[PDB]
Amino acid sequence: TLNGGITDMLTELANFEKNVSQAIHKYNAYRKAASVIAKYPHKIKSGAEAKKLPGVGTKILEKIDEFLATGKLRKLEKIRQDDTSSSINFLTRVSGIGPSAARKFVDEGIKTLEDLRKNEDKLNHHQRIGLKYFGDFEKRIPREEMLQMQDIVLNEVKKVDSEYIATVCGSFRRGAESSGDMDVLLTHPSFTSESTKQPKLLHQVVEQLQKVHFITDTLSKGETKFMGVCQLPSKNDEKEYPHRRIDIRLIPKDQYYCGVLYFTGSDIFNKNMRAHALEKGFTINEYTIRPLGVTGVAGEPLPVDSEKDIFDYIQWKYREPKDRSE
DNA sequence: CCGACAGCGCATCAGC
DNA sequence: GCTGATGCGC
DNA sequence: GTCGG
Ligand SMILES: Cc1cn([C@H]2C[C@H](O)[C@@H](COP(=O)(O)OP(=O)(O)[C@H](Cl)P(=O)(O)O)O2)c(=O)[nH]c1=O
Numbered sequence: 001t002l003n004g005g006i007t008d009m010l011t012e013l014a015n016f017e018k019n020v021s022q023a024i025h026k027y028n029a030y031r032k033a034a035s036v037i038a039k040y041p042h043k044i045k046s047g048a049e050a051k052k053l054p055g056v057g058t059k060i061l062e063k064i065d066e067f068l069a070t071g072k073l074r075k076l077e078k079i080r081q082d083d084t085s086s087s088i089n090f091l092t093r094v095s096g097i098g099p100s101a102a103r104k105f106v107d108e109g110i111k112t113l114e115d116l117r118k119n120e121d122k123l124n125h126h127q128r129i130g131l132k133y134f135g136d137f138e139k140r141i142p143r144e145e146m147l148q149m150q151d152i153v154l155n156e157v158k159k160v161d162s163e164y165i166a167t168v169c170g171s172f173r174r175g176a177e178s179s180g181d182m183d184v185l186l187t188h189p190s191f192t193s194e195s196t197k198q199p200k201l202l203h204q205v206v207e208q209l210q211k212v213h214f215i216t217d218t219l220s221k222g223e224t225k226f227m228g229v230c231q232l233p234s235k236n237d238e239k240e241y242p243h244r245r246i247d248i249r250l251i252p253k254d255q256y257y258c259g260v261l262y263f264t265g266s267d268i269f270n271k272n273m274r275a276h277a278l279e280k281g282f283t284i285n286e287y288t289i290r291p292l293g294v295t296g297v298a299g300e301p302l303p304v305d306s307e308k309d310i311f312d313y314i315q316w317k318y319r320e321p322k323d324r325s326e
Numbered sequence: 327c328c329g330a331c332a333g334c335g336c337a338t339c340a341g342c
Numbered sequence: 343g344c345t346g347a348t349g350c351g352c
Numbered sequence: 353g354t355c356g357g
């Protein structure tokens with residue numbers, strides 16, 4: 001909140017570069033800048049002060065001086081006024097519509113929520129569901145509701161096979177008082193790095209959650225990753241809860257620590273951590289941490305028996321999930 | 327000045 | 343049908 | 353857009 005106006009501005013610029021310019025490096029640069037400023041514990045008085053932070057360079061420094069002087073940025077003011085950019089930006093807020101589809105729809109004169117609804121036949125499945133719950137997916141999930149959803153998912157999973165372990169990750173595991181969605185990491189001893197001893201491991205779980213009407217819709221589904229929609233049950237006479245996004249990722253049981261580090265995030269925390277790993281001569285994914293040879297070619301997986309082990313390898317002090325919200 | 331910027335699952339398409 | 347590129351998502 | 357080398 002200390003530098004909320006600045007980080008909002010940068011986020012708006014990031015979104016512009018992603019959705020309209022389709023300049024993903026500019027997008028990621030703006031988000032990095034916004035992140036480093038958000039955790040900076042002083043109210044920023046100048047661009048030069050902000051430029052001391054890594055990730056803030058000359059251009060963002062100048063923007064920050066304008067914003068501090070006047071409370072706005074002319075570049076953003078003009079972007080806001082531009083119909084095509086505003087339209088493109090809006091359409092990407094539908095799950096499954098990205099920068100390319102958004103611009104394509106705008107070209108055909110499909111540029112409002114109303115246009116989308118009347119042109120449902122021109123959407124793929126993911127987009128159609130994204131449009132169906134557009135309102136709901138805008139809403140945050142209070143932590144108290146996340147606790148209920150967790151109870152339901154862990155108990156239902158236990159009913160399918162008591163050897164499943166389901167772990168809620170994402171912002172929830174980072175201790176947030178509200179989340180954008182629910183992220184569930186799933187393991188079963190039958191699925192390891194070495195073998196898949198039984199099939200349908202993800203399916204049976206999804207099927208059980210569909211059976212008790214917790215999962216209501218599917219955006220995408222594969223053997224290890226489910227992306228869909230869920231809803232808490234409501235009591236008699238009470239308004240229904242909003243429909244929520246849910247992600248479920250099944251990871252080899254012996255690779256749980258790399259898996260839970262990944263799915264706990266944040267996304268920018270993962271990006272910084274993995275970038276750092278590279279500078280230290282390692283590569284990290286949701287399965288393994290591996291050394292980089294002289295080549296650049298990845299070596300064999302290093303042994304890992306905790307999240308801290310991964311931090312150790314790259315010479316980072318351990319950071320608790322709650323300090324990983326970047 | 328220049329190249330690199332994290333790493334990967336699922337849906338959809340062109341080409342064969 | 344398969345393989346690889348592309349889009350969108352985590 | 354930023355930064356290390
Ligand atoms: C989008 C993304 C996610 N992840 C990892 C790290 C992420 O933490 C994890 C879940 O993605 P999420 O989109 O649900 O992120 P979250 O942290 O739960 C969000 Cl603050 P919210 O859902 O509360 O709004 O996946 C990445 O490693 N790279 C990414 O680009």
Ligand SMILES: [Cl-]
Nearest residue numbers: 023024025026
């Ligand atoms: Cl770019």
Ligand SMILES: [Mg+2]
Nearest residue numbers: 170171181183
């Ligand atoms: Mg989440």
Ligand code: NA
Nearest residue numbers: 051053054056
């Ligand atoms: Na800087």
Ligand code: NA
Nearest residue numbers: 092094096097
């Ligand atoms: Na979208």
Ligand code: NA
Nearest residue numbers: 181182183247
């Ligand atoms: Na998610």
